[PDB]
From a paper:
The breakthrough X-ray structure of a fungal TMEM16 homologue, nhTMEM167, revealed that TMEM16 proteins are homo-dimers. Our results illuminate the detailed molecular mechanism by which the lipid groove of the nhTMEM16 scramblase can rearrange from a membrane-exposed conformation to an intermediate state that is occluded from the membrane, forming an ion-conductive conformation.
Hydrophobic interactions between TM4 and TM3 that keep the groove open are strengthened by I343 and L347 in TM4, and L302 in TM3. To relate the mechanistic hypothesis to structural determinants, we used single particle cryo-EM to determine the structure of the L302A mutant reconstituted in lipid nanodiscs in the presence of 0.5 mM Ca2+, to a resolution of 4.0 Å. The predicted disruption of the interaction between TM3 and TM4 is validated by the observed increases in distance between A302 on TM3 and I343/L347 on TM4 from 3.7 to 7.4 Å and from 5.0 to 7.2 Å. With a minimum inner diameter > 2.9 Å, this pore is compatible with the movement of permeant monovalent cations such as Na+ or K+ while sterically precluding passage of large cations, such as NMDG+, which are not conducted by nhTMEM1624. Thus, the L302A mutant loses most of its lipid scrambling activity while maintaining significant channel function.
Numbering used by the authors:
A (entry chain A), B (entry chain B): 16 to 97, 101 to 128, 141 to 267, 276 to 319, 324 to 403, 427 to 468, 478 to 584, 594 to 652, ...
The structure:
């Protein structure tokens, strides 16, 4: 039970240069209290001063709610519009309570010591929520709407990308179990059910997204963009950066990908040649070490390159934040692409079909159905042990490593422990959950019992991430978006690529020489077939109008209906009898002489 | 100079059943004059009664203009909104003058003798317009906007699809002349310039369309649909037809296409075998007759099948008129597809590559560069002679075939000659102008001097159609639409198909056997390349925002801006000085003991 605290600002004051710190502290307190929010000061841990803020006069906040609530009517966020009477008719949920206060602390008014503004956690909510998700098997729609209020939309959107990827993994699980029991291995009919399913999930998601963004009322938030504060500009007109200076910096991404093809490629050369060096030249030390080299070497080489990619993203300047996450993810996607697939491509397209010709520079049948075992059993239980147990143990032994006070002796002892954690972001979870999908879309026909093991690691990741957010990471500052950023696009590229490599595989590792002809014809057939079932499920799933969408078109019409119903509410042979007389006259005149 | 007449209704009364005709005539006159428009009666020609209507009280018409002008604000046709004051601020153009009167004559109120309602022509406008288009080479944007006012939007839209297809034919003309002079015949570099150009024209058109539909203010008219009056319905809910009865009728289209593959295919078997029958077994009668068999046999076999296709479209019932032209065109497209290409496919994919194997059931090099000469010189000058000269001669000799009267002796003699003509539709012109594009998109690399002859038959068709509308067809009843109906889609299919067949051709009629390998690899490369340059010109031509579009986003904002600016216009350590005092105290308290 927090003491009504809405935010906590850190304001670290070090030993050196501490004389520009007290005046800057007064500059912080005055600028905070002119906005209209109270302040308190406690101790930190070593040299810091945890400043506590909350809103004080509820009328200024209730008008502040209105000052953006009828800002959302302006830019076409929602259609409807409600004199400070937005509290009883439709209340303020805990998204809009904590976002607008965060919009009052950082503002364009129309600081090199503040470490990190961060909200607090309510632990009376956590032991209900993490328990009640673990006694259910499925999850209802109304339980995701109980995670929107307390965390935001962009944290609540990832849990709806998981739930609607759960229940579409049950199709190629069961029809993947059949192709492990009934049909033989590497068969073509699995390579089109996995070809068909990777459009039905991808297109039923893009229709469920614009429905579920209507019901929350945040449909058009991607149209508005706001300025990132670290933007630079030479001369204003709205500000502008010289765009030809961005071409000189964006081109350095090509020596990043050129470093990416050689770095993650260097590990598989270490993996392949150490496999032979321990084979020919401790017998049980030979079969346990190339596993333990690949689980401790890979997330270090993916750490130093992504940290180099995060540095390249800040040097390449960007204007808007929506164009900032559209370039961090692409420079991070190619990095995690060549790390979690170039151990698998080189086995299936070079090692197993060309195992005769590469030999003077035999072939064993136990590698492609064994390396796919790696990325499905032992590279997930080393991941679930790392994503939860390692930070929980690292923070528990660190708690023992230490060397008005009525209830504040414990309330400071909760919030001081918070600020040494990391801010949880749903960028990394989407990057994993979009990389894991690949295996069951490109390299799945090489071992058709891959879906039925991924469906048990998404009934735990649906509650592992619910555990990680509340025991090992401070609450994310709530944001709003409509779709899953740029992830949806690079989800499409993991569909077409999955439908090509898969077709080539259903032909090589199965005509006597199996090369040139059947291979190219099979890939062309499986590619053209994809580009035809990407239209029919763009045609069946486009004549089905959603219920939500009705709530937009009616209220657009009904408001437009109500708006104008509260504001308005020569040859002259004249004589209509004269005209019909000659009409009955002329038609008999034409028929009394013929 | 017409006498203010806005429409002419025919009302043909025959010999038999003429007793239900005078009472029905009075039923016509009364229902016309209760709407509020005057009536006059003249003679017809043989048994008819040309009824003349015009609007009488300009206040009822000026409110009728408003009754749909603020109907267009309701359904989101345009954003802006102007008490019968829509005459001086923005006047009524001659589209909206003649459409609304036509919307008063046919109405849902909220007749088996009336032949055809049709507007009249102003011949003081025609001799200016057809002359002034023939003294210019190019055409300015402001001259197409002088054809919108007098004819509509859907007649004025076809002249903007021609003008922006004129000036993009100048690219593969000049770079087609080079591939006839510099480079050799059947070269691959022409097969990608024709591959690139068929996206740049197709994507620059779809961007110029939403611009030019903004400036006319008819942007969203395709969203509204209205009921076709000949619709049937069993039980209402808005009415509804049983949709499973439509599946029983729509399936009969498959025996139409199955009749289409055999009928137009039967003519080329007649073309091929009569060529040999006159070759072996009058020397100048041998080289002139297979031309004269193909120009008089083809538009008869395309007449009886399209008339069968028009009968199938009326039997298959449809609700809305927008779903009526989306099924007449598709059933007419496949008919004109297999007639103007299956004489050309069978030559280029069977005759010239497989000329050895088919021979016992030699090969000559003079057929593919001679049959492409047919569809470019002699099948256009037989078409321009048919589209203009034949109906003008047929109507001139028919004028000699005949067997209050102050100025009405000549004014009846103009309007009586009108009603025996045909109602001009821009469906057929789009069908031709979309079929002719194919030759320069699929079969163009087989004879790279095809564009430079199509660019002189579109400087005449740009004024032949301007001649046909005013000398040989009554004025079309003005309509409104935003895009070129369903033509734009089946324009896209003529792009991908053009990029495949063309790639196969650049490999067959040019490895020694030229088969299986290079062929499939070349088509795959030219198809994948297409699907990559369909993204870059969906990315360069999508970061360029149009000027028109600015006029929508500002006036949406400025109205929304103006609308709300004309209606509105605990731990308590209180004392901001107390808070900053302990703040300067604690940071020294933490640094007077360390
Ligand atoms: Ca995981
Ligand atoms: Ca994870
Ligand atoms: Ca023509
Ligand atoms: Ca024509």
């Amino acid at each position: 039970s927090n003491f009504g605290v809405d935010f906590v600002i850190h304001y670290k004051v070090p030993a050196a240069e501490r004389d520009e710190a007290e005046a800057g502290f007064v500059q912080l307190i005055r600028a905070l209290t002119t906005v209209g929010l109270a302040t308190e000061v406690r101790h930190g841990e070593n040299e810091s001063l945890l400043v506590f803020v909350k809103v004080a006069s509820p009328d200024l906040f209730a008008k502040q709610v209105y000052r953006a609530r009828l800002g959302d009517w302006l830019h076409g966020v929602r259609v409807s519009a409600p004199i400070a009477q937005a509290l009883q008719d439709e209340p303020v949920v805990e998204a809009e309570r904590l976002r607008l206060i965060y919009l009052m602390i950082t503002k364009p008014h129309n600081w090199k010591h503040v470490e990190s503004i961060f909200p607090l956690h309510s632990h009376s909510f956590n032991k209900e929520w993490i328990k009640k998700w673990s006694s259910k098997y499925t999850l209802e729609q109304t339980d995701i709407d109980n995670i929107r209020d307390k965390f935001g939309e962009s944290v609540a959107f990832y849990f709806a990308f998981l739930r609607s990827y759960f229940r579409f993994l049950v199709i190629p699980s069961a029809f993947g179990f059949g192709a492990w029991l009934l049909l033989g291995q590497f068969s073509y009919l699995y390579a089109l059910l996995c070809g068909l399913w990777s459009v039905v999930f991808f297109e039923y998601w893009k229709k469920q997204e614009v429905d579920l963004a209507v019901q929350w009322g945040v449909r058009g938030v991607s149209s508005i963009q706001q300025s990132r504060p670290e933007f630079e500009w030479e001369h204003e007109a709205v500000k502008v950066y010289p765009p030809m200076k961005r071409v000189k910096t964006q081109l350095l991404q090509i020596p990043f990908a050129l470093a990416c093809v050689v770095a993650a490629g260097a590990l598989i050369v270490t993996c392949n040649s150490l496999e032979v060096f321990i084979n020919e030249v401790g017998k049980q030390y030979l079969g346990f070490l190339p596993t333990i080299f690949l689980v401790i070497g890979t997330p270090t080489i993916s750490g130093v390159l992504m940290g180099a990619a995060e540095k390249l993203n800040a040097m390449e300047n960007y204007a808007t934040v929506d164009a900032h996450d559209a370039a961090l993810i692409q420079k991070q996607f190619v990095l995690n692409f060549m790390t979690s697939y170039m151990a698998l491509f080189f086995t299936a397209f070079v090692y197993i079909p060309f195992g005769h010709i590469l030999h003077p520079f035999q072939i064993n049948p136990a590698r492609i159905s064994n390396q796919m075992f790696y990325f499905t059993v032992t590279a997930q239980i080393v991941n679930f042990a790392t994503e939860v147990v390692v930070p929980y143990i690292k923070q528990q032994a660190f708690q023992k490593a230490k060397q008005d006070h009525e209830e504040e002796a414990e309330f400071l002892q909760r919030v001081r422990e918070e600020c040494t954690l990391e801010e949880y972001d749903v960028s990394g979870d989407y990057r994993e959950m979009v990389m894991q999908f690949g295996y069951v879309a490109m390299f799945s026909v090489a071992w058709p019992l891959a879906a039925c093991c991924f469906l048990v690691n998404n009934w735990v990741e649906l509650r592992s991430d619910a555990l990680k957010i509340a025991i090992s990471s401070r609450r994310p500052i709530p944001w709003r978006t409509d779709s899953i950023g740029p992830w949806l696009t690079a989800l499409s590229f993991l569909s077409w690529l999955g439908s090509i490599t898969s077709s080539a595989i259903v032909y090589l590792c199965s005509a006597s020489p199996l090369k040139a002809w059947g291979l190219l014809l099979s890939i062309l057939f499986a590619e053209h077939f994809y580009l035809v079932v990407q239209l029919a499920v763009r045609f069946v799933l486009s004549k089905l109008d959603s219920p939500g969408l009705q709530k937009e078109r009616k209220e657009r019409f009904q408001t437009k209906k109500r708006l104008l119903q509260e504001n308005l509410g020569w040859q002259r042979q004249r004589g209509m009898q004269e005209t019909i007389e000659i009409g009955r006259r002329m038609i008999e005149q034409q028929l009394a002489a013929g």
